[PDB]
């Protein structure tokens, strides 16, 4: 719910900067001279930054020493049709790159195989100024690398077409992460109204980073491998470590956990990594079922939780939810719901982005207002 707090920034500023540096007099001739010998070379740009440079396709050699000699020899009469197909090869890549840049206005968000092949991408990763752990991590998950990297068409002149592939760096690696799932927590009285609802708004990803916690509210903008969490530090807030205390005790004085108050008695289901939370309120049918045995649990009104072991499906009203069948250990921490600690007459009926101290203090405000009469 905290996706609005993030700051905005330019994503391709680095690639565009390298492009503006590639328009200087002599920088493309520098790169061409560097690649005159081999197909890969480290070049110190006029901007100070040293970049790896690849020659992914050589058409000048083929066209000028294999096609033009045979074509314009006597009367351009060709004798074999395998030349046509041999030229359809080695040319499809350029056409597809042109089409990809034309449809995306010169900047593509996932780096395709046409932009950079897996062999070329691995060769580029292995010769990068990064540690061997980062090299291994990038080499094992090339698909996530392509998803989180750009390709900015840079310049075309001096018989050379250049585009800058802007790759992630993955500076922070192997630090512990944890996801926080939330669901509405309401009271279960039978009246149609006067039913207070409380929710936690800090849902999303959390990772330890330089003594602080990088928190990602938009958990959808985070890819997950077997147990590795690829996130973008730009889609993140930076919080103190004490925020984790919001799990061990939610009324602690050190950190103030952001919450949300409402009066909407709506049944919902939130599927976590290894199980499902069910907020069953009203007259809604809430069900936990196994694939081979049918319904195995009927939920009573309130906020409950089931593990993914033996439970394969959670039904709420007419909505069906398939639970993740990922292996792990689940734990049920019994405790009294916090919502039973507030007065329904003094409870703030509406506050989107609030906290424990803010809501608790506003309760003092309203109670002082009522007591004065």
């Amino acid at each position, epitope marked *: 719910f905290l996706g609005f707090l993030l700051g905005v920034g330019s994503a391709i500023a680095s690639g565009v900067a390298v492009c503006k540096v590639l328009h200087l007099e002599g920088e493309v001739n520098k790169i061409k001279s560097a690649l005159l010998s081999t197909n890969k070379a480290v070049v110190s740009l006029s901007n100070g930054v040293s970049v790896l440079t690849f020659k992914v396709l050589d058409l000048k050699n083929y066209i000028d020493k294999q096609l033009l000699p045979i074509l314009n020899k006597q009367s351009c009469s060709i004798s074999n049709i395998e030349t046509v197909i041999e030229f359809q090869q080695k040319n499809n890549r350029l056409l597809e790159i042109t089409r990809e840049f034309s449809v995306n206005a010169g900047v593509t968000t996932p780096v395709s195989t046409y932009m950079l092949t897996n062999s070329e991408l691995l060769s580029l990763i292995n010769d990068m100024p990064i540690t061997n752990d980062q090299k291994k991590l990038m080499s094992n998950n090339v698909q996530i690398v392509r998803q989180q990297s750009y390709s900015i068409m840079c310049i075309i002149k001096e018989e050379v077409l250049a585009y800058v592939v802007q790759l992630p760096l993955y500076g922070v690696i192997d630090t512990p992460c944890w996801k926080l799932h939330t669901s509405p927590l309401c009271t279960t009285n039978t009246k149609e109204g006067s039913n207070i609802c409380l929710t936690r708004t800090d849902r999303g990803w959390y990772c330890d980073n330089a003594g602080s916690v990088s928190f990602f509210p938009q958990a959808e903008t985070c890819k997950v491998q077997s147990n590795r969490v690829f996130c973008d530090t730009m889609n993140s807030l930076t919080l103190p470590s004490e925020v984790n205390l919001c799990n061990v005790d939610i009324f602690n004085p050190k950190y103030d956990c952001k919450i949300m108050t409402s009066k909407t008695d709506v049944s919902s289901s939130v599927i976590t990594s290894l199980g499902a939370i069910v907020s069953c309120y009203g007259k809604t049918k809430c069900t936990a079922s196994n694939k*081979n*045995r049918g319904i*195995i649990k009927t939920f009573s009104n309130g906020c409950d939780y089931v593990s993914n*072991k*033996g439970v394969d499906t959670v039904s709420v009203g007419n909505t069906l939810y398939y639970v993740n069948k990922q*292996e792990g250990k689940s734990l049920y921490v019994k405790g009294e719901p916090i919502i039973n600690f507030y007065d329904p007459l003094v409870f703030p009926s509406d506050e989107f982005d609030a906290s424990i101290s803010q809501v608790n203090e506003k309760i003092n405000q309203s109670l002082a207002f009522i007591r004065k009469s």
Partner: antibody
Amino acid sequence: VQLVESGGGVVQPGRSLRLSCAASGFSFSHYAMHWVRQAPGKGLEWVAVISYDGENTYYADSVKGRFSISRDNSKNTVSLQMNSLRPEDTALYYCARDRIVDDYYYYGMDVWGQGATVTVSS
Amino acid sequence: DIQMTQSPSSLSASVGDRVTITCQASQDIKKYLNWYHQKPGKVPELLMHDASNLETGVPSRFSGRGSGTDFTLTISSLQPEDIGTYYCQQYDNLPPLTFGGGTKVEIKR
């Protein structure tokens, strides 16, 4: 697919005995494992079961408190330790695979081993 | 726990006869029942699960019917390799998985 069982023999009443059963040919770490005995000439008797992770063990009423089931997924083995043996425990014991994989509800046995004979007679 | 009874204790039929054996439970096991066939001196082989779902490789002459408390296993044409013992076993909701008393099947003398 193969389940090789060992540890059978003759044991005087009241003593202990441990049966083992090794698996090969399937992903043993994801199947619940059953122990089922059969008296000579009589029918089949369910003895015990253990889930895929090994954190859920169920015993028959006639062997509750005496037998104990355990598993080891690094070597693909299931062990049934039977102490304080009565003469009614003399039977042939099979280790069997649960038909349905990766579940906490046990359904039935589709792959049976050859068995180990256990005689209790004094 | 749930008690299971098979009928008949034994039967003797010629090759090709239609054989129908019955299994009954003390309470509702609605469809959580398997049928096993133990050949003489062999391991028990799973014939079918869910009281009607034939296991792959089992000859189509075997047919399972029934629900609730009563189930039937039927062989349309009894064969030589069909002799032995037949066991019904319930798996209703969190073991003990009780078996049945078994049914002996032999070819005529």
